[PDB]
Symmetry: D2
Subunit: 277 residues, 4 copies
C-alpha cells in the first residue's frame, strides 16, 4: 500500500492565521500538525508517503521533512495548483500509487487511541474501500454515514473521519468525477461509488478514541490542550514520528540519538533520549 497526505487547501476557517502559514504546519502543542497524519500512515506500515501541498507552502514542508530519511520513510512531494478538492489526491497521486492500494489521510486530522495505532496495518490488504465512523454533536458540519448511505454536510450523528483505504480502482473512480456546486472534487463521491457497488466497509472507531479536525480556531486550540493533557497527566507523548520509526525498525538507536541531539532545546529531544533509557 502507498500513502498520500492531503496537505494543501486554503484553510479559510482559520483566516487570518492561514493567510500566513499552511494549516498543516500549525503547532499542535509540541509538534507540527502534519506529524499527526504522517504518523498515522507510518503506524499502518506505510513507508512510501506522498505529500500533496500548495505551490506556495511547499518550501516549509521541505524544510521540515526533506525526503523523510531521518524518520526512516520515503517522503515525496506533489503539487496541487488550486484547492480543487480532496478527490484530486488520487489523480495527482496516480503515479505514486502505481498498481498498489492506497491510504489517504487528511492533513488536519488527529487519530488517537485504541485501534488507531499499529493495528491499522490490517488495512493493507484492502479490497474495495474502507472508511470509519465517529459520533459527533453537530453532524451537519461533517460528512455523515447513515446506518447504507452517505451525505456531505441529517440522520445518524456519525461523521466520517479523514482516513480512507482503497484498492487500486480508486484512481479511475476519481478521474471520472465532476466538481460539485462548491467547486471541489468530493471524497464523498468516491466513497459513494464504492458504497453503491457493495464494496464499502465501515467501522465505528473504538470506545475511548479521540478523532480531531483542527480547522477552526476552537478545534485547533482544543487539540493542542488535549495533547498537552496527555503528557502532563498520563506521561504520554503522541504521534512522535521518530519513536514510531524506531519501534518499527526503520531507524536504529544511533539514528534516534542523532535526532534527539538536534531537538534538545525545546525538550522534544529529551523524550527521544528517554526512549533509550
Amino acid at each position: 500500500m502507498r500513502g498520500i497526505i492531503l496537505a494543501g487547501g486554503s484553510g479559510t476557517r482559520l483566516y487570518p492565521i492561514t493567510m500566513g502559514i499552511s494549516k498543516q504546519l500549525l503547532p499542535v502543542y509540541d509538534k507540527p500538525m502534519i506529524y499527526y497524519p504522517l504518523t498515522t500512515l507510518m503506524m499502518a506500515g506505510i513507508r512510501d508517503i506522498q505529500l500533496i501541498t500548495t505551490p506556495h507552502d511547499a518550501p516549509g514542508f521541505h524544510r521540515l521533512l526533506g525526503d523523510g530519511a531521518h524518520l526512516g520513510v520515503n517522503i515525496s512531494y506533489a503539487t496541487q495548483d488550486q484547492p480543487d478538492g480532496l478527490a484530486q489526491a488520487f489523480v495527482i497521486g496516480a503515479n505514486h500509487i502505481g498498481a498498489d492500494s492506497v491510504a489517504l489521510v487528511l492533513g488536519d486530522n488527529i487519530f488517537y487511541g485504541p485501534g488507531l495505532g499499529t493495528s491499522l496495518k490490517r488495512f493493507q490488504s484492502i479490497s474495495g474501500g474502507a472508511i470509519f465512523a465517529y459520533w459527533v454533536a453537530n453532524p451537519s458540519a461533517y460528512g455523515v454515514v447513515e446506518f447504507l448511505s452517505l451525505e456531505e454536510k441529517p440522520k445518524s450523528n456519525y461523521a466520517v473521519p479523514g482516513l480512507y483505504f482503497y484498492d487500486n480502482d480508486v484512481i479511475e473512480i476519481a478521474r471520472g468525477l465532476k466538481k460539485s456546486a462548491r467547486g471541489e472534487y468530493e471524497i464523498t463521491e468516491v466513497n459513494q461509488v464504492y458504497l453503491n457497488q457493495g464494496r464499502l466497509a465501515v467501522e465505528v472507531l473504538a470506545r475511548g478514541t479521540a478523532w480531531l479536525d483542527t480547522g477552526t480556531f476552537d478545534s485547533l486550540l482544543d487539540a493542542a490542550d488535549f495533547v498537552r493533557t496527555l503528557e502532563r497527566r498520563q506521561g504520554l507523548k503522541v504521534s512522535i514520528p521518530e519513536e514510531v520509526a524506531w519501534r518499527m525498525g526503520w531507524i536504529d538507536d544511533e539514528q534516534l540519538v542523532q535526532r534527539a541531539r538536534a531537538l534538545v532545546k525545546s525538550g522534544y529531544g529529551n523524550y527521544l533520549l528517554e526512549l533509550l533509557e
Copy 2:
C-alpha cells in the same frame, strides 16, 4: 517615531514546529503571532513599521501582511540573513529609522492590559532609552533589571520585556557592539550603554498586565488559552489590527467592512462587523 518588529530568529526552543514555520507566524488562538507586536506599535501611534525576517520565512509574511495598506499602516520589510542577534535591528533598520526615534518590539511578545494600549503614545517623545519591568518566578530565564543594573540570563525577579523605545543615538550604539559568547549582538548591551550614561528610564508594568513570550511549547499554548479565555469570559478580542486602525482613523467604515467580508468563514470578520453594529 519609527517602528521595527524583530520577526526572524531560529526559534530553537520550539523545534520541530519552527523547522517548518517562523515562530512569528504561529497561531495564538484567533490570529498569527505577529499581530500582537504589530498592534502594540500601532497603539503607540506608529504607522511606519519595518518587519525584520529571515530570507526563507519572508514570503509568508508578505502573503499575510503585504504593504499594510489594508490596516492603514506602512509595512516594509528587511532581511536578516543569519540570526545574529536582537541588536542588529538598529543596523538593519538604520535607513528605516533615519533621524527619528525608534520603537523596537520582539515578534514573540504579547502585551495586554492597563498601560499597554494607546497610552504607549507617550513614548514617542523619548530622549535616551525607555524599557520596562515585570515580575517573574524564573528570572534566570530572562534579562533582569535590578533596582541600577541589568543582566542577561540572580537578584531582582524583574524581567525586562521585549518592548524598547530609543532616541536616534541607538543606531551608533548598536553599530559599536561585538557578538557575545553565544554569537549574538545583544540588546542588553544596548540597554547597558544607556543605563551607564544615566539615560535609561525603567517602568514596572501596571498591576493586572499580562506579558507573554511565546517561544516554548508551554508558553505558546498558555498564551493561546489566555486569549480565548478573554473572549469566552469577558467578551473581548485583543490585538485586532483592523480594529486598532479603525479606532485611530487610519481606516474608515467602508474599509473595515471590506476586511470583515474577507474573514467571514473563521468568525474573525463577524467581530469586525459587530464593531460597526
Copy 3:
C-alpha cells in the same frame, strides 16, 4: 442599605456533587463560591449581611464564615426550610432589612470587571429598583430585559427600596417557586425599575452546571497566572475598605499559610 445572599437551593444541575455539598461551598479555584457574592456586597459598601441557607448546609457556612468579624463585616444567618424560590429572600430577610434599602445577590453568581467593584456604592441611595443586563447568545435560558420575561439577560444582582418586602409577601408561586422576576416587574409596572448594561469587558458567571463551574475555576486561575490578579479575596477588600488593619490581615495570613492564599495577603503588605 442591607445585604442578603441567597445561599440555599437544591443545586439539581450539579447532582451528584450537590447531594454532598451546597453549590455555595464549592471551590472556584482558590476560594469557596460564597466568597464571590460576599465580596460583591462588601464592595457595594455593605457590612451587615444575611446569608440564607438550607437547614442541612448551614453548619459548613458557620465554620467558614462565623460572624464575619475577621472580614470586618457582620454576617448573620437565616434558614430557608424548603427551596421555594428566590423572592422568599425578602420574606425571610424582612426583619434583617427593616426600614432600609436592600442588596440581593445570588450565591452562585460571579461578577468581575469595570463597574462591579467599589463603584457599586452608588446604588445605596437607590429609590425604586435597579437591575442589570448582560448580552447572551441564548436569552431564552434567562430572564430577559428590554419589558421582562432582546439578548439581554438579568444577572443575580439586585438593588431595591424598602418597598420590596411588601411586594414579596404579596407574590404567589409559579408553574413552582416565588420568583424574583415577579418582583422586578411589579417595580416596572410603577415605572421605577432601572436597568444598566454591564460594562464592556465584564465577566458574569453562574456556576450551576458541571461545565460552568469548571469554566469559572479556570477563569479565576487564568487571571492569577496571566495578569497576577487574585480576585474577590474578602480579606483584601476589608483591608482596602479600612475595615480591618495591617495586623488583622497578618493574622489572617498565618492561618492560611499552607495553601498559598495567605502568602498573597502578606504581599499586600508589600
Copy 4:
C-alpha cells in the same frame, strides 16, 4: 478482602475552601472526589467498604452515599475524632477488617488507566503487603520506594494481610501523625512488601492543592470531551460487575437527569 477509605483530615493546603467542606466532597468535574477512591475499591472486587470521616463532615457523606445499596455495595461509616494520621485507619477499622485482608485507599487520590480497573481483583489473595510506584520529578515531596522514606513515589493505594491491624496499634506518632510509611517498612523488614510500578500511561492524581484539584477536574472533562469517556462512575461499575440491574440503573438515571450525569447512565443501556 475488606476496604477502607480515608475520607477525613483537615485539608490545610486547600484553606479556605476546606474550612467549609471536606476535601473529599469537592467536585472533580461531574462527581464528588469520594467517587474516585470508592470506584477503585469497587473495581478491586470489594463490596464491604468503610469510610472514615471527621465528626463534622460526616452528615454530607451520609446524604451523598447512604448505605451504598444503590451502588450495589455496603458502605459503613467510622468517625475519626482528630486528624491523627493515616495508619489510624487500621485501628479505627480493626473490627470492620476482622479476620480478612484489607484494601486502603486515600480519599483525595485518583487512579486512572491500565491496571487500575477490574485487574485489581488480583490483590485480594494478597499475603503480606503490596504497594505501588509512580515516577515523579520531585520525589522529595513524597514517600519514596527503592528501602522506603529513586524517583518513585508511593501512591495512596495499599493492600495488606490481616497482620496490618497489629502493626498499626503498635506504632507511635511522628515528628505528629500515625504514619502509613511506618506500616509499609515493618512489612519490608519482614521482606514481604511487594511493589509494582503503575503501567505506562496511567494517571495518578492527588487533589489536595488549588492547582492539583483544578488540574484533575480539567483532566476528567478532557477525557469526556475528547475520548467520550466518563470515568469512575460508580453506578456504571456496579452495573458492569452485576451488582445492580438494567432497571436499578434506570432509577439512578431519573434522579440525575437535570445535570446530564443521568443521561450517560441511560446511554449505557444503549
